[PDB]
Amino acid sequence: YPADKTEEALTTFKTLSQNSYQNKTLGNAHNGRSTADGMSCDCEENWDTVSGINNACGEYSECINRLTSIECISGTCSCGDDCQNQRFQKKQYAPIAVFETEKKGYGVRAQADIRQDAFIYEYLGEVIDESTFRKRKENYDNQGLEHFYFMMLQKGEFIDATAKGGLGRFCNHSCRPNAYVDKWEVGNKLRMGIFAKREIYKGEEICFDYNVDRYGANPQKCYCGEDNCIGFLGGRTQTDSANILPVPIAEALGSTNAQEQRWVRLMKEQNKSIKASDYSSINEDYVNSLEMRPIADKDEASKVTSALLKTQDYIILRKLIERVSLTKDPEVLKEIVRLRGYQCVANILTMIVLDQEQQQVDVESFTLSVLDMLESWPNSSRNRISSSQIESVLESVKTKLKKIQPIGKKINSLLNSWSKLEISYKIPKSQ
Amino acid sequence: RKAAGLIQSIQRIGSNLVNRAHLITEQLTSKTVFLNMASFVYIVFDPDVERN
Amino acid sequence: RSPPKDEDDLTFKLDELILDDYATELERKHQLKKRSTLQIIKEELQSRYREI
Numbered sequence A: 001y002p003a004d005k006t007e008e009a010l011t012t013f014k015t016l017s018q019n020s021y022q023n024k025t026l027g028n029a030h031n032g033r034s035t036a037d038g039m040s041c042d043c044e045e046n047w048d049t050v051s052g053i054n055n056a057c058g059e060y061s062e063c064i065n066r067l068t069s070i071e072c073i074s075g076t077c078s079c080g081d082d083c084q085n086q087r088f089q090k091k092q093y094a095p096i097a098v099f100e101t102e103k104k105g106y107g108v109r110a111q112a113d114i115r116q117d118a119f120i121y122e123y124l125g126e127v128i129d130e131s132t133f134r135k136r137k138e139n140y141d142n143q144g145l146e147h148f149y150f151m152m153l154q155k156g157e158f159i160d161a162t163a164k165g166g167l168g169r170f171c172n173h174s175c176r177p178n179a180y181v182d183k184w185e186v187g188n189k190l191r192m193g194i195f196a197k198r199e200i201y202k203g204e205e206i207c208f209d210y211n212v213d214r215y216g217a218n219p220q221k222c223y224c225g226e227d228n229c230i231g232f233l234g235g236r237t238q239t240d241s242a243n244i245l246p247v248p249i250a251e252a253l254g255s256t257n258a259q260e261q262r263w264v265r266l267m268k269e270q271n272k273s274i275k276a277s278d279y280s281s282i283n284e285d286y287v288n289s290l291e292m293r294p295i296a297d298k299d300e301a302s303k304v305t306s307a308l309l310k311t312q313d314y315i316i317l318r319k320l321i322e323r324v325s326l327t328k329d330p331e332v333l334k335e336i337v338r339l340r341g342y343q344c345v346a347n348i349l350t351m352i353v354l355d356q357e358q359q360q361v362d363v364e365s366f367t368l369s370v371l372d373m374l375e376s377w378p379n380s381s382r383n384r385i386s387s388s389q390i391e392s393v394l395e396s397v398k399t400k401l402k403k404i405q406p407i408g409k410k411i412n413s414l415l416n417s418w419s420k421l422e423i424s425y426k427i428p429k430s431q
Numbered sequence B: 001r002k003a004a005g006l007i008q009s010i011q012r013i014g015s016n017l018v019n020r021a022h023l024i025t026e027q028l029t030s031k032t033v034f035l036n037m038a039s040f041v042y043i044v045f046d047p048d049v050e051r052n
Numbered sequence C: 001r002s003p004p005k006d007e008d009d010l011t012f013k014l015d016e017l018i019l020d021d022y023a024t025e026l027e028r029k030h031q032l033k034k035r036s037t038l039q040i041i042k043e044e045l046q047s048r049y050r051e052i
Ligand SMILES: Nc1ncnc2c1ncn2[C@@H]1O[C@H](CSCC[C@H](N)C(=O)O)[C@@H](O)[C@H]1O
Pocket: A103, A104, A105, A106, A107, A146, A147, A148, A149, A169, A170, A171, A172, A173, A174, A220, A221, A222, A223, A224, A225
């Protein structure tokens, strides 16, 4: 496996055993209202005489304070000293190591198998106010740092892990994380712990959801590798009307922040229903009402290819194919060929005219609207097609819809045109 | 003489040569001299540094 | 990113290539004599900058 980088990671910052405070007023529980009647659990101390360990307030015990995310304090609770609900104070962190893989920096891995709901590691840092946070953020942006190191302890109170903190700062974002951050009360103070969402084995990376507020900062692309990745690091939108479809997909359709604003502003503010921000359900009316302009940028072509590889909706694919019909720039088409647009168009065909979630007349209109640019694009070799074998799909769909003779004749012309093109070499291999 | 000029040019640009093509794009060397010397000077590649 | 059992890298698959047919096709298409160059590329790919 990857080489250990634990000491090298430790040397990059001032290691802390506990959270540091800018002042004694910050970080106090109940907004500084000292609960003199501290919540004392009614647990009886359970001392195992063999090991001398106080087993009270354990994981499978019925300690009320543990359920309510409050730690027992020695000398005040009936559970006695050294109970099993002093995890933050005793600093009983899980054993972890630091390593590096993929496009990520340093990352945290489990040195041992960790149970579900087990406390992993206490996020450490300096407790700071809002103005100090703004000053440090401006300084780091001037320094060009490309890493988040701020977490919101609570309203108006943040934790900075840049110069001083703990191993938890090296945990990387995952869109399907195995751990999560939670807020707990220890004495008259507030702590942020990290707990295991599931069973984690040795060697596996430990990750948590950042749910990051950008505060107007630019998006950063997410390289977590999870299948459910949204592609960028963020959280909830700063207001409604901000997105209706995912960016790459929205920009593939020619839509931008203004066009996504305009639809919601025209209907939602005038007593017509638009659901919350969720891309699992496509709103066909927005896609139909969207305006379409020809593509002349290769990054937009890459976004179109990503939308083809991602979106399953019939209407979004219809409007993307219509936009491609408007598009006539040869360089963008050559880029789409390099991106293997034929491969995506094969699946787009298959989902609509082999799988039947729609009506035959509308599918016929779709097929006539998608054969045209296939007929129009520049082609110079069958090796372009060989990366997709879309001809096979064309044969299957002309055979299925044999009653619709215009589609069959167009596919005849298309395969006749493609049959005459040249071929390119593949090195023979020993046998 | 060409070696000393090359060393001085590299020290001007930043004492680090990222790519072989920078001997032409940065005007450090001429066409035929680069064509001769391109495959005999090398830049050590560390995969951990270049994830892309 | 996931090397097989007891192999550092996928450079061992180069030994299945038929370099002779590739050199023949290069000579036909582009009139380039590159038969020794394919061997040099293969050796360098299998071990970058050996001690010769
Ligand atoms: N899944 C991911 N993909 C890309 N960058 C990630 C990432 N998870 C974390 N990061 C990066 O890591 C930052 C958090 S700090 C994590 C430790 C740091 N990468 C280091 O090795 O020093 C994020 O702001 C982001 O820049």
